[PDB]
Specification:
4 copies of one chain form a homotetramer. The first copy, chain A, is an all-beta fold. Chain A has one domain (about 1-115): Beta Barrel (Lipocalin). Chain A has strands at about 5-10, 15-20, 25-30, 35-45, 55-65, 70-80, 85-95, 105-115. The first copy, chain A, is globular. Chains in contact: A-B, A-C, A-D, B-C, B-D, C-D. At the A-B interface, β4, β5, β6 and β7 of A face β4, β5, β6 and β7 of B. Chain C: One of its GO terms (cellular component) is extracellular region.
Chain lengths: ~120, ~110, ~120, ~120
Amino acid sequence: GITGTWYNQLGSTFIVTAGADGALTGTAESGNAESRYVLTGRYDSAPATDGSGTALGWTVAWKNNYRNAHSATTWSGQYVGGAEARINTQWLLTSGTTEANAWKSTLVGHDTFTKV
Amino acid sequence: GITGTWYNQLGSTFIVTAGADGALTGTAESESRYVLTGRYDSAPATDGSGTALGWTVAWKNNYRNAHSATTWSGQYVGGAEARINTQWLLTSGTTEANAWKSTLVGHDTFTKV
Amino acid sequence: GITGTWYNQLGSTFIVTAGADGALTGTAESAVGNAESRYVLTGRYDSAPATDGSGTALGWTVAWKNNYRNAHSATTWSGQYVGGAEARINTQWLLTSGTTEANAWKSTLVGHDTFTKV
Amino acid sequence: GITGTWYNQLGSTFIVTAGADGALTGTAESAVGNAESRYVLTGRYDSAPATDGSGTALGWTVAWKNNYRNAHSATTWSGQYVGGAEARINTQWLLTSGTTEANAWKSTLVGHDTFTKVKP
């Protein structure tokens, strides 16, 4: 269920593969190789059967062969296989700063992913 | 720089390998050991900025499973008292109507001790 | 545009008054309107926002104690007001519970709420 | 106990008064960002905290507008007061700036502040 192509609410494209031992691997993009970055993470490979969703998280560092923004985003959330399968997340984006600007280093937000 | 053993505020031990390709792999040890994986900026600036990174632990191994995952977002700061400063989000699997309460937030500081 | 009754995705009802000197005061209550479910809110907002189409920054707090009950916690909402025909307040919130020192690492929840006029 | 002058790790000064009704009122002077002079602070606290050694839940907001400057943003602090020899308030915060819609995704910063009654 988690394996596939997912889209967030602003239209970015996340191609994710879920491995048997809890690994998440894939890529995050915009439609150019210049805008493609590697993602990696983990998920709960044996969730509960009570109806709960499946907890997961992943990271993207915003460095590829073409560009480097000196930043990384982590998404923390859960997959729900409902009428529409979705992944609901909260994220944190941290930019490299000097320690004097460290208090403003980190943004927070939320993203919903769908296969549509 | 990043590769090695790191200790957080509450005596947990993280052993991390920083790959040349930007990969972070390792373990988090608090039966208590779990895989971590993540990414870091493998070509950071040299203007005194720290190096941006993130990683994820899903809290399942061969013995236990808390149906949760934690992601840490932060940066490595090199030097005399090297540290990794982070913020984290812990998400637990909930049902639909408990989802408002699925996510904790906090912060952690890692040192080489 | 902020003064009025706002409803979040949970159905809860927030009655907010925005005063001329950036004060926000009001109540949070259940759909059902009973006294037991009513709590005080206080916060602040940008009383002279940009004219560029930007929204209006604001925040407020609710401690979940009233004369009837006490959950020993507080929620803060940080967000901005977007006006128009589909005025909304977009927020992220932190909820903190009183905890012993041992449990402080798990004292604070985070999430997001969107408020509408309808 | 909560009433007093508090300082965070960055030297900012917060002068808070806890009312018997659960109200928090006061002033903030920040050492960082787009600011100068004092700004109004308002919030709420649990005026009847548990008795089991748990902290006192609280929160407040500052909108960063005064007669001198306006940064079009507001910060909320959420946390708890821990009484004692060295009393302290441990918080997490959210800072939201007014943006347009297309920029809304990068509108909110998140952090943590620790306050003491003794200035660093």
